């Protein structure tokens, strides 16, 4: 209206830098996560806010996010000083050391951009993680990300805000993991007595949701079948996961023995056969490690199943149906199920108009 206005538009570019982290760790708690976080993190928010960027489109790629690589190295660096095994077998080399039992419960960690950088964040609720996001925004720090190490099932994570989401670097390539995100957590109650409970009816629907999302991805005319792990290491074949310092290996066959869209009492609560193990394969690198025997007889751990790691079978034969089995192993997929909407960017001089 005769009042020419000059805008200073922001300019950024994809980049990589060492991020820091923030946690609600306590300097009086002697559990490993709190101990590590304390000496290795910053106090928290406490009222986080983001800068919505109107009518801006940005491209993401969860499968090539250097935020993951950094988090992975941190969780590794955590276990090194935390869970001390009695024996460590790596590369024809054998090591023996003390192995004290220690309290072990994951604490949410926020990864933050340092001075000069920023972190774009997708606000689009149903976002696959690779492609344009037409609803981004800026943040100082990510959200609370628990370093939950495990396979088959993703625990204590983040739920989809709308419908069940599935993500894969290549749905066509059958060797590729299918990270799954639930919009409704399913409780899995564990115990040192060697079993794990899961509501049957709830988990049933949970599979119908996933199935419908998969049938959609591979033609809405294919029958969706779930089957047990096709084989591998104990940490892959069973729902491997940590719970109070002890490593649990739970049979998951009763979970993944369903057939959907096919044609074609009644357990009240699926009970999974479980067992701790002193001798386990390493996720850090290649090798094995042996730990001490369990201590207290009270080992109860209740967690929320918020995600799944599946793999498809396929092949030049499977027509009219698809087969999906539990999977996982690469802990990076675990990270990518949380760090999928983020992206660190370098900030530079503004551009006039």
């Amino acid at each position, epitope marked *: 209206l005769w009042v020419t206005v000059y805008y200073g538009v922001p300019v950024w570019k994809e980049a990589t830098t060492t991020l820091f982290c923030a946690s609600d760790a306590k300097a009086y708690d002697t559990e490993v996560h709190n101990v590590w976080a304390t000496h290795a993190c910053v106090p928290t928010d406490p009222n986080p806010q983001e800068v919505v960027l109107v009518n801006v489109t940005e491209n993401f790629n969860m499968w090539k996010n250097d935020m993951v690589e950094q988090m992975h190295e941190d969780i590794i660096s955590l276990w090194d000083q935390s869970l001390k095994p*009695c*024996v460590k077998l790596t590369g024809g080399s*054998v090591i*023996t*050391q*003390a*192995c*004290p039992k220690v309290s072990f419960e994951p604490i949410p960690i926020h990864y933050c951009a340092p001075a000069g950088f920023a972190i774009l964040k997708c606000n689009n609720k149903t976002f696959n993680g690779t492609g344009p996001c037409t609803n981004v925004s800026t943040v100082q720090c990510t959200h609370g990300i628990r370093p939950v190490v495990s396979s088959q099932l993703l625990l204590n994570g983040s739920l989809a805000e709308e419908e069940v989401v599935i993500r894969s670097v290549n749905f066509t390539d059958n060797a590729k993991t299918i990270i799954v995100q639930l919009n409704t957590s399913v409780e899995i109650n564990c115990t040192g007595a060697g079993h794990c409970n899961i509501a049957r009816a709830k988990w049933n629907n949970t599979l119908k949701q996933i199935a419908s999302k998969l049938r959609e991805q591979f033609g809405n005319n294919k029958t969706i079948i779930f089957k047990q792990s096709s084989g591998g290491d*104990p940490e892959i074949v069973t729902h491997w996961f940590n719970c109070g310092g002890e490593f649990f290996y739970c049979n998951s066959t009763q979970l993944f023995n369903s057939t959907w869209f096919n044609s074609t009492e009644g357990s009240d609560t699926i009970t999974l056969p479980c*067992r701790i*193990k*002193q*001798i386990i394969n390493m996720w850090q690198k290649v090798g*094995k490690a*042996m*730990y*001490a*025997p369990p201590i207290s007889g009270q080992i109860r751990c209740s967690s929320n199943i918020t995600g799944l790691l599946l793999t498809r079978d396929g092949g030049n034969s499977n027509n009219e149906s698809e087969i999906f089995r539990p999977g996982g192993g690469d802990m990076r997929d675990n990270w990518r199920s949380e760090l999928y909407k983020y992206k660190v960017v370098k900030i530079e001089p503004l551009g006039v108009a």
Partner: antibody
Amino acid sequence: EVQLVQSGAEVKKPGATVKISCKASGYTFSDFYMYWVRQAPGKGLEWMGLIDPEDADTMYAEKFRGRVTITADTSTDTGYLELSSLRSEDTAVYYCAADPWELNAFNVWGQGTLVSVSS
Amino acid sequence: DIQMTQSPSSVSASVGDRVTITCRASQDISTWLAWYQQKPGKAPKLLIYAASTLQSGVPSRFSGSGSGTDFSLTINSLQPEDFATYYCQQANSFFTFGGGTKVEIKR
């Protein structure tokens, strides 16, 4: 009730490879570790290795690595033990033990298996 | 591997006497230790597990203490059927045995 019944004495020449057994009874075999120990004539006990039958996870002492092998036929509740490249100082009694009560020590033992290796 | 070193190698004592034999790991192994008795011509007998816990059906005059690296088995009123060879043993992962300690009589 619980028991570990090994095999009989065996004679071998240097360089041979012996493989003794240890049929177990009185408990669920595949749910517990099994350990192997040998004892030279009038000398101290000497551990050799262990194994979890379920996943066949094995551990060996340094003095035997890449020369000894422990397995466990889960179907017949039997455990075996192989020793490649036998020498003259391998002449000893071989025990097998277990711990069906999980005290982390050897509670049950075998009667023993004398292995004599000479020219 | 981790070394278990027990001493003395031999010790002579009379009946009623009180005897102490010690063990020592080259690395911390907590309270995961075990003591065995073994008389000539037969298989070893579990005495103590968890360094201090007495095995069932074993005379109360037997007891072991210690934690971490330094341990010790001790017999109060020594008996005629207590003269044998005793062994300690790491029990947390590997199961290395100590050299051995022979408790013979005394005359």
